[PDB]
Structure formats: C-alpha cells, structure tokens
Design a protein around this ligand. Sequence first.
Ligand SMILES: [Ca+2]
Ligand SMILES: [Ca+2]
Ligand SMILES: [Ca+2]
Ligand SMILES: [Zn+2]
Length: 541
Amino acid sequence: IETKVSAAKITENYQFDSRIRLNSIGFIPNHSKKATIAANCSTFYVVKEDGTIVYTGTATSMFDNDTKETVYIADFSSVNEEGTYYLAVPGVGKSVNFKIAMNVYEDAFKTAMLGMYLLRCGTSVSATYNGIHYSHGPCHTNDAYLDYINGQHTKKDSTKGWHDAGDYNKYVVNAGITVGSMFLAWEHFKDQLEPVALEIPEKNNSIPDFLDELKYEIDWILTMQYPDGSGRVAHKVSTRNFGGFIMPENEHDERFFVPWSSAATADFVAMTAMAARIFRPYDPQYAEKCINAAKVSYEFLKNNPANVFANQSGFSTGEYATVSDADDRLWAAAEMWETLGDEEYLRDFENRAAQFSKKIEADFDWDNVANLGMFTYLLSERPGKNPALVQSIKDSLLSTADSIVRTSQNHGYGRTLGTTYYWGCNGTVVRQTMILQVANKISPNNDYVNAALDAISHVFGRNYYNRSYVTGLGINPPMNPHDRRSGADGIWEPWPGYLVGGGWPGPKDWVDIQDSYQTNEIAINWNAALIYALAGFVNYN
Ligand SMILES: [Ca+2]
Ligand SMILES: [Ca+2]
Ligand SMILES: [Ca+2]
Ligand SMILES: [Zn+2]
C-alpha cells in the first residue's frame, strides 16, 4: 500500500552498459550533470540506489565530430539532492553508481596528492590505499655527481624531489609547470586548501599539508643551482640512459647534474620566488633562503639574455628542451615582482608581456609557461600595473575562456580540448581549468565553472572509453601504466592517483599497456594539472 508521500520507484531491473558514459565519481549540487549515451535512446531516469525515480528526461542527439558518431546527451543538472544515484536508460541499460554531494571530489583530490607523495625520491615511501600496501625503500640517495658540470667526479647533494614520470630522473623544466600549477592552486584556493590533511609524514607539523608536499620538491630544486655561485641552474639529475623496470631503491647507477639551460634557470627563479612568498608565513627562514637563491639566478639571467639549450649529448633520458625561454623569463619576472614588489621586476615583466601577440593560450604545458606569468600579474593586488596591458591580458583571458566553454558545450563528451590529441593531452584537458577558474575570478560566470567540471568529468568517465584515466579511481581505471614502480613490484594493481598521458593522435588511440609510454605513462605535470582542477572543488560551497 502506497501512501500520498510514497515516491515513484523503478520497475525493471537494469544491467550495467558501457554505452552510458559519465563522471564515475560524481557531481556537485548546482552544477551541470551530463551523460553521453552511445546508443539510440530517448527516455532516461536518474534513480536513487533504493529504486526511487527522482527525475525523468529525454536524451537529445548530437554528432560527435571527434569520434564521428551520433551520441545522445542526457542532461540531469536539475537533480540537486545529495545521494548515490545511477542513470537508467530503457533499452540500453544503466550507468555505474555515482554520488551527488558538495564534497564529492575530496577523496579524489587526496588520492591525486597521495600520487605525488608516492613519487618522492631520496626517501622511503609507504601508503595503504584500498587495502593494498604500496611502499619502497630509500632511493637515489647518492644524487648527484659534478662530472658534467665542472669535471670533478664529486658528489653535491641533490636528493629529494619527485621522480618525474614512469622514469626516476628529476628534470627542472618539467618541475616548473608542475610547481607553478600547484602553487597557483594554493594561491587561488588557499582557504579551501589550508585545512586539508594528507597522508604524509609531515601531517603533524605546523605547515599546511599541501605545502609540505611542495616543500619536498623545492628542497630539491634549491640544490640545482651551480656550485660556482654563478646563478646558473643544472637542467636535470639523471642516469645516462633510462634504466629498466626495477624498484627505485635498486637503481644503483650514478646520477649526474646535467649542464644548465637558460629555461631551467628562469623556471628556478619563478619557482623559488613563489616559494618565498608562500612559505614566509610558515617558515620565514626557508623563505629567506628561497628569495636569496631566486635573486642570484635572476641577476644572472638579467645579464645573459640569450636562450641557451642544455648540453646533454651524453644523456639519453628526457630532454625537456623547451624551444624558447622567453615565456620562462616572463614568468620569472612576474613572480619576482609579485613577491618583492620592485619596479625593476614589474618593468621587466611588462616589457616582455607586450611582446606576446596572444596573451593567453588555451593549450599550454611545460614548454609554454607564459600563462602562469600572466595569471600572477593579472590577479596581483599590487599597484603600478599598466592599465592598457591589464585590459589586453583580461580580454585575451575571457576570450580564451569563452572559446573553451564553446568547445566543451559542442563536444559530444564535454572535452574542453576539443579534437586535439597529442602526447600528454589528458594533462592539458584538466590544466585548462586554470584558465576557466582565473576567468571566473575576473568575471564570474557559471559557464566557466561548469566547463571546468566538464574537463574533470571527461577524465573520470565521460569519454569514449567509458574509463577513468586516473589509476585507483573511478570506473575501470588504467591497470598497466608505463610506470616502473608498478611494473616492478609484486602487486597486481598499479600505484594509485595518477592521470595517464592519453591517446593520440586520435580519440580512440589510448592503449592501456605497459609498453605504451606514448599514451599510458604518468607524469608530475599531468598530476599537477589534475590537482589544480580538483583543488577548486575541495571544501567547496
Ligand atoms: Ca603538515
Ligand atoms: Ca618555454
Ligand atoms: Ca604491479
Ligand atoms: Zn628516487
């Protein structure tokens, strides 16, 4: 007997069907919620796990130019009541269960941060995730020799930091966009991130956990300044060739400092200038050490304007040879100015900024970090900015954010990067949230926040594969990443919390096999983009 308050309940029993693709983690109340159904259909129900039909709708068809298929879009954004639901599509089947909650992304954020902790070098790491224990002993404790720097086969401490990707070498240019992304997440969402506790050794000190993780990397970056006091910064610490699939503590080859590059030197300045202002409130002494190092390398750069590529002929590991250091130098000037305030730094930034035709780029990564410099300058509360330059950057930013909104709204799976695929493009999909969040800070628009959620949803299930691209999370995540710890331990499931690079050159080119470093590797710059994307939705209201 049904009363006047009994709610409608699903009649038939549905089976999971891979053609119903959506964010496998969940949605936030008051934001878009969409699913892409790769099957002909019309009616769909959003059902609570108890069988209660909460919403009935009809899917609308749309041609996915990317995969060249007609797909059906189920929009259930109106459902805003917290709970666990699933999508039931008569004739197709049902989706995985997902949650609608204000804090739906917090575990994902903590897991992506756990990913960074597990990438630590020079120390033993240990974590239990979903009941499986991941750990490894102290590794690369003898970094690194000066042979290629000065000639002496002597050791200068260069331990700590994070292994870069599937390999264990540490590269400065890639640490640039990584550290920059994560420090910008802290500056943009400080109030949301400060109280977050992570599973790290430093959980019991006086520094916000998010910053302890970044400190592990900055501690390493500081050791990269040449020992001659010239201010030049070594490009990377690396073995001569890529080692094999072994645990890091078993890699005994000697690691060397590789000759400097101007880009690495400019990135060093930007990273340590940011660290100086961000750590000052917590460890003033550490901040002083950072700003002094930044000043030495900046003086060098100021006197040697040429773009210089690192001499790394004897090495066969990652190159990270950014074609230009103009963007890196622009970023360094913006960070020195924001931290210090001197007119000298502001003048340097503005002179370089004017030389950029398009102030903001929708597609950016380790090679083009100008956006980071534009972001710091644009949001700075310091006086003195040339109002014409500000308006120029602002227009470019909003114009770019609008383009990304239009792209995701017209993509059959809400992909912000549209039809563009290339090595590491999954990282860029979520890195685009930086543009959207900054645009939202300058000119509030919920289209910007929803597009950011589209980028996040794309990576967690609303994609052609109906798979999460992050190990240990969501639906059918990567099982075989090109990752040495994963390929060499005795555990079935790979190490958790990593966004894989992604397929290319096409939408269906991702392959989840260990040999595919082209589409299935992990990397700090990809995880940093994911961390920034999720950060804005931690302790969110
Ligand atoms: Ca702490
Ligand atoms: Ca560059
Ligand atoms: Ca394994
Ligand atoms: Zn290591």
